[model samples]
Target: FTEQPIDLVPNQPYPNASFDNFKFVCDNIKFADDLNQLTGYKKPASRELKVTFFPDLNGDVVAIDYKHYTPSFKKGAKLLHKPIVWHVNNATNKATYKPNTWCIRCLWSTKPV
Candidate 1:
């Protein structure tokens, strides 16, 4: 698992508006394409990327899971301590796994600054 930086700004005002720095870890160390193929689907025409967050017991975004067509559960199974980022593309398509693009800055906390 790797720690990435991200900056989050809330739209609300003052105390109501707060930002959080998130670190994302994955259960499986694989690429986005690998997941897409495994799940048996093509990239979206809109090219609209998605981001998913996973939380630990502390309620922090300690880990992330995404969807890939072909998720190597067998390989990922080895890392039980880490959280799994299942690449979810089509919510209806169980086979189509849509994983997010791996962004170092987005995953971690580097957006605001």
Candidate 2:
């Protein structure tokens, strides 16, 4: 006797979007929680914050750091990019960042200026 062929179907798409939301794993990388020290300010500039991402040889983010900058203290304020919140693991090993507030995608696909 011969067996009949069965219909084949492709698997459903991934239930969740893991590409955009992924954690950066760090190994043997230094971890610091303090802001950078600027020469102009007596103490770390609280107004300005910076987060740097370091990619490894495999092109994967392996290290990160937070810094503070003392911009030109001119007559008035200046513009800033969207707020980003960084979260660290219990041992401050892995981390991830995301927009702190509501964010939208542009139809033109142009990123934030």
Candidate 3:
């Protein structure tokens, strides 16, 4: 890849963008997850993945104004199954979630990729 513009909102979209393409070699490379631990670079050599993007990426000013947007199934949306209870957050507008409870969840993927 080539170097993107080094700014935003003024033709500088990628400020100080460090990048490379095709291949790269380094004279020295070092890193650590924590102190006093020596280990080789660990990374997913190659893997398949299913990715999803939520909502959309908004700029700084746009983000603040959009933060209050809520999640809902819609006015007429309904489940055709048995009468099941759902937990909804009035502030966030998300449904079927709570924290560390019977009907709660965290950020995680069901399938191991």
Candidate 4:
């Protein structure tokens, strides 16, 4: 019952508007974290951040990595446990992403992106 609106995504993923600067149009909205990286930069280009999401053969999520280490992921294999998410609760009015998770998930190798 908690599915991401996959149709809203065209290529890769999409982002904000009315007031822009995010990655998708759940409603042309974007929130620039109100957070900055440990490296002291808020934007990706300013930082050495190479964030990527891993999806398996079924087009399901593997994990998301936003680390700045060498080899991207493999160079920092132990960093998986420290994964962070930039999620928004489309059902809420908090004005920012809050901590949340699915009430139920049915998965094998992939999930709706």
In model 4, state the lDDT of residue 102: 17
User: TM-score, each model?
Assistant: 0.20, 0.18, 0.14, 0.21
Which candidate number would show the highest TM-score if scored against the true structure? 4
User: Which scores higher on TM-score, 1 or 3?
Assistant: 1
Off by over 4 Å in 3: 1-66, 73-106
Q: How are the candidates ranked when ordered by lDDT, highest leading?
A: 1, 4, 2, 3
Candidate whose lDDT is highest: 1
Candidate 2 per-residue lDDT, tens place, 1-113, comes to 53211221111112331222112223432322321111122333333223333322232221222221112211111112222222243123222222111111100112221
Alpha-carbon local distance difference test for all models: 0.29, 0.22, 0.18, 0.22
Candidate 4 at 18: error in angstroms?
Answer: 32
Of the pair 1 and 2, which is ahead by TM-score? Answer: 1
Each model's backbone clash number: 24, 0, 3, 7
Off by over 4 Å in 1: 1-30, 43-47, 51-113
Provide the lowest-lDDT 10-residue window in model 1: 5-14
Candidate 4 per-residue C-alpha lDDT over 1-113 given as tens digits, one digit per residue, 9 for 90 to 100: 64322221111111221211112111212312222211123233422222223321121121222222223222112222322222232232232222211100111112223
lDDT of 1: 0.29
lDDT of 2 at 8: 15
